[PDB]
Design a protein around this nucleic acid. Structure first.
Lengths: 205, 86, 80, 148, 82
RNA sequence: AAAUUGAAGAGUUUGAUCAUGGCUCAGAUUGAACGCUGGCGGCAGGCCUAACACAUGCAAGUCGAACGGUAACAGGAAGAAGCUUGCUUCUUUGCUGACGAGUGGCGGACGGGUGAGUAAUGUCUGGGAAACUGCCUGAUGGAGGGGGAUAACUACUGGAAACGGUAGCUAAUACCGCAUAACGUCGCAAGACCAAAGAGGGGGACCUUCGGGCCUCUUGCCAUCGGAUGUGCCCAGAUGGGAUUAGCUAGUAGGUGGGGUAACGGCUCACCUAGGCGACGAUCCCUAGCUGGUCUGAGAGGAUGACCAGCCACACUGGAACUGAGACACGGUCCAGACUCCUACGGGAGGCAGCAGUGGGGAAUAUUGCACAAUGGGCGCAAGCCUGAUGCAGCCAUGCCGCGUGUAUGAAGAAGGCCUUCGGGUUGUAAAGUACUUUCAGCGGGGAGGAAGGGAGUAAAGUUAAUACCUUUGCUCAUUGACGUUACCCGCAGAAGAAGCACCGGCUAACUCCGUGCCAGCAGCCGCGGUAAUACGGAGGGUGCAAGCGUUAAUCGGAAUUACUGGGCGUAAAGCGCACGCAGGCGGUUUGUUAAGUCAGAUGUGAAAUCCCCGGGCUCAACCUGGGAACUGCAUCUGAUACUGG
């Protein structure tokens, strides 16, 4: 139910950094970042219209750690919801607990944050939530529970976090290891070389 | 029958059947006497017979052997015809 | 409260009965054209006052025979 | 308790011992007829109970695969053994039989004795040995090729 | 006769009852005449959990409808609540 | 506030083209199966085939507060004794807590199963009038005085069994007279006529035949008029196909009268009239349970009727009625048929389309489980008993949803493999190493909720002669969970036990080498294979999915490819060889009228669930749930009169 294999392969295939490692290292010193995996990585894909749509959807999925079934269901919900579907898809992803745990800096990666969640190290409103896809709401307070507070992963995670751009819609107290999901992120909060409308196109045909 | 009470019910329903049959046969007899008088043209015999019949079609109604409406028609019908002749 | 039908007499042969035809236009469920439909009713005509071709007003009542559950209310137009 | 006999598996529905119609418990000494198995097992074999049936499903199907692989193996050899498109002589005339016995112990045992009466001149072979009774596909089996 | 009782809906281990007026012979979750309340035995009790149209319940009693042991309890409980 | 605010195209005829036209693909969906693989959980689903046949258990009982009663076990007792003098065992007696068999009452018409039959004594929508209706309910009165029986039992007797035969004998809320009898039935009226039953709980003077009287309350019984629920009946529209089926019909259509039903009715019979149906599809033939809804589609449609709910029909096959408020009875009766079982040979017995289970058929569909704790049904004043309804558990990846199978760091980037122009590229931060976490599975510890009630006491009110009893409502005490090792929480051990499947020529995301050589083989469509095959088979690499993945089957979509919305017929499939013409469709222009079509409004109905919208509850989700909106439909009334019809 989770992708467990090599991670930089995914970045290499999509042509971009997917933040699947902590960021302690320039990614180009860990892999040949600008070349696809495999014997024929140097080869260029003269890539069809379907192809660009597929790869964009894969990219987003691989960023958030979501497999097809759940992600399709995410599209369905984005569509049902009011307002722009493409933007609704990203709101839903960005509201996941494993994700939010990552953005408050409690985990070096979404993979690490997910493990924190699954392993009962995260509370929401002082209540233990251990499922990664838990949808987090405005004004919620997610926190590292007392016993998980001395984990060195978390301190390192918060350090790296302090060096990333700081997300607007979250208020994080690094000392308490608690943080507040102030509001749903706008579209403008999220990276601009994500092409949701391509993903929207892939799932309407 | 297979079930204990099913057996008992068949026994009771047979008893009731022979009870009802007996009273029902009696009743129709007393109804038939009236129609027979009518068909012979006698007011008195037919009125007399109607008077014997009345209390028993009424009673068998009260006793559930027949419904009230049946008792009534019989009285209505015979009364109609006997009057129409004398 | 006098629910009623209007139609014309297609048969007056029977003793104290009549056959009445009620005709109406109906939208076709699929192709939209308006189609004629007819409903023939066996109706009671005590006194046999209804002639064939007459236009008559009828009403629904209890069963009067295996096929009669309608009786005559009154004649409207006659002997065209 | 789940019981596994040969390549057959299943849960026991009921237990019968000799004349006794029902027995609650059975010891290593006294024999008890077993019931509720998927199908009629081999005439004899080693039987072992298991904790769960799901774990014993793959094992039972595994034994079928081997028994089926050798079945097709012995089928290819006997046909190819002649190394010629036909028989070298006129013994080609043969008789076919169809057998279904109520008991599983007999069909394997008496067939061996039924192959003893076989001769070079006339060859007899058994087709579709049954576990019991008779059936539609069995009568159909005797319909295609003339047999008793 | 006509009775007022609980038809058990909800899910396995999470009972949820629909209070209904019905011919007592019909199945518990089958044909009913009128729905008249509900009863959640698993309500958090932080908010609601038991709602009865007492006006229609009484109307039906007035016409001889009987009442479950469990509905007879709910009614005394709800009458106490307010 | 919101609540249908939604719609894609690709390959393939040709040397190439445009058109025509079929085939094929991308999508959703499934009660699926098979092949490979397979960790946990929540919720759902699970004989689609043979309405084939079924061993065994269980699925309908209950009331001693209707009745005679004791045979079991349980005490109790004058009196027998265990006697070691208060502990007792048996002989006895229903004295009573109870209770086998019996009469009696209520239930066995519900609940549960199936879809064979049925194109209509069906269903859906909407209306009618001639009716009955147990239990529950409001109203008003009865509940008087008698009689003959009978099961049980006793004696004698026949049977292998099933089950009988004689004569005794006895009870009742069993059964029948008699009285009483109207706001009931018949009748214009005068009049005439119809019923019943007791049983318990407690008790003050009072007293006897010590049974009770009598006092009191509960409950059942009878009558009549209502309510509520259920059911029967009637009309209209709609609800499959076929003309290689065009005529059909004697109870047939109607009328009169008698009979009949709970009730209208050719329901039935006699007589009379000669009708009734049919091209707006009768008759005949084929097929089929209908609906809410389900799947698909932007929609209009198309397909469909498991699981949930409503109606119908059936209960081995054909027929029949008896009992009853209700049945022509799913575990009742009778006859006939098919079939099976028992037998001591003479005779008997049964009907899983209830729940498990078996054989058979099949590509294929589960345990002969636990519990009445909860909801609900039957009986009972109750306690309670019964409940394969139901709640649960087992089995299966069948589906949906959730989670895991680790996280981070880790380079000249090892070995091995693979490609290479031998420079190197790749597998690949992948592995090893380094720290780090412990969900789930394992193991110990603790521990919600589903529980409302019911039981003893107590107190107050209504009762009443009464503080009894009864009933209601408060109080305390001790109690009721099949699931269950529950949900959930804490602790321990270690990355430890948890990854496979299909694909990579174009459509279509993913390319190379070796082997083969029109072979072996692939193939949804085009089309691959005779020496460079990205198409066969293996490998390395890669793509897509992931506890699944593929293949097959199946509906709709794309298919504007049955075209109502939404197409065509000169040469592509398609104008009858030509004309006349009945039915039918359509019909110039003006006025008046009508108001069926059409339009408007109002009212009722359109079950709930489902779908959709906004909320609420399970850690999330599936799932459960509140309210709304929607059900685009039907019907009645009242209007409007331009258009269509008269």
């Amino acid at each position: 139910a989770r992708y467990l294999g090599p991670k930089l392969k995914l970045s290499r295939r999509e042509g971009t950094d997917l933040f699947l490692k902590s960021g302690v290292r320039a990614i180009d010193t860990k892999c040949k970042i600008e070349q696809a995996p495999g014997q024929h990585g140097a080869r260029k894909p003269r890539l069809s219209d379907y192809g660009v749509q597929l790869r964009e959807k894969q990219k987003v999925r691989r960023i958030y750690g979501v497999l097809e079934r759940q992600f399709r269901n995410y599209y369905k919900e984005a569509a049902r919801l009011k307002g722009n579907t493409g933007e609704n898809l990203l709101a839903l992803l960005e509201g996941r607990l494993d994700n939010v745990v990552y953005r408050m800096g409690f985990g070096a990666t979404r993979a690490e944050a997910r493990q924190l969640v699954s392993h009962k190290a995260i509370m929401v409103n002082g209540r233990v939530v251990n499922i990664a896809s838990y949808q987090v709401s405005p004004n919620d307070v997610v926190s590292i529970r007392e016993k998980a507070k001395k984990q060195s992963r978390v301190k390192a995670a918060l350090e790296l976090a302090e060096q990333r751009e700081k997300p607007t819609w979250l208020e994080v107290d690094a000392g308490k290891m608690e943080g507040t999901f102030k509001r749903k992120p706008e579209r403008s909060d999220l990276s601009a070389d994500i092409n949701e409308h391509l993903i929207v196109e892939l799932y309407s045909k | 029958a297979n079930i204990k009470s099913a057996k008992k019910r068949a026994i009771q329903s047979e008893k009731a059947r022979k009870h009802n049959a007996s009273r029902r046969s009696m009743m129709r007899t007393f109804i038939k006497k009236v129609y027979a008088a009518i068909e012979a043209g006698d007011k008195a015999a037919a009125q007399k017979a109607f008077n014997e019949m009345q209390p028993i079609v009424d009673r068998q109604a009260a006793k559930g052997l027949i419904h009230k409406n049946k008792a009534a028609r019989h009285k209505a019908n015979l009364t109609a015809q006997i009057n129409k002749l004398a | 409260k006098i629910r009623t039908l209007q139609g014309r007499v297609v048969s007056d042969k029977m003793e104290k009965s009549i056959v009445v035809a009620i005709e109406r236009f109906v939208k076709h469920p699929i192709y939209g054209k308006f189609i004629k439909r007819t409903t023939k009713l066996h109706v009671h005509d005590e006194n046999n006052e209804c002639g064939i071709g007459d236009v008559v007003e009828i009403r629904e009542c209890r069963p009067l025979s295996k096929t009669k559950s309608w009786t005559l209310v009154r004649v409207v137009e006659k002997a065209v | 308790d789940i019981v596994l006999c040969g390549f057959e598996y299943g849960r026991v529905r009921a237990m019968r011992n000799e004349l006794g119609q029902e027995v609650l418990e059975a010891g290593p000494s006294i024999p008890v007829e077993i019931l509720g198995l998927s199908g009629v097992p081999a005439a004899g074999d080693e039987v072992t109970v298991v904790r769960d049936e799901k774990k014993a499903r793959e094992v039972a199907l595994y034994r079928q695969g081997k028994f089926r692989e050798v079945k097709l193996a012995r089928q290819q050899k006997s046909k190819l053994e002649n190394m010629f498109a036909n028989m070298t002589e006129g013994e080609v005339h043969e008789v076919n039989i169809v057998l279904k016995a109520d008991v599983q112990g007999s069909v394997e045992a008496i067939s061996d004795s039924l192959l003893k009466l076989s001769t070079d001149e006339v060859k007899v072979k058994i087709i579709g040995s049954g576990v019991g009774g008779i059936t539609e596909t069995d009568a159909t089996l005797a319909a295609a090729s003339n047999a008793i | 006769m006509v009775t007022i009782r609980l038809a058990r809906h909800g899910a396995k281990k999470r009972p949820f009852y629909q209070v209904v007026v019905a011919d007592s012979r019909n199945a518990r979750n089958g044909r009913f005449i009128e729905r008249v309340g509900f009863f959640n035995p698993i309500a958090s009790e932080k908010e609601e959990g038991t709602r009865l149209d007492l006006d229609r319940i009484a109307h039906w009693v007035g016409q001889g409808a009987t009442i479950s042991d469990r509905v007879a309890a709910l009614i005394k409980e709800v009458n106490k609540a307010a």
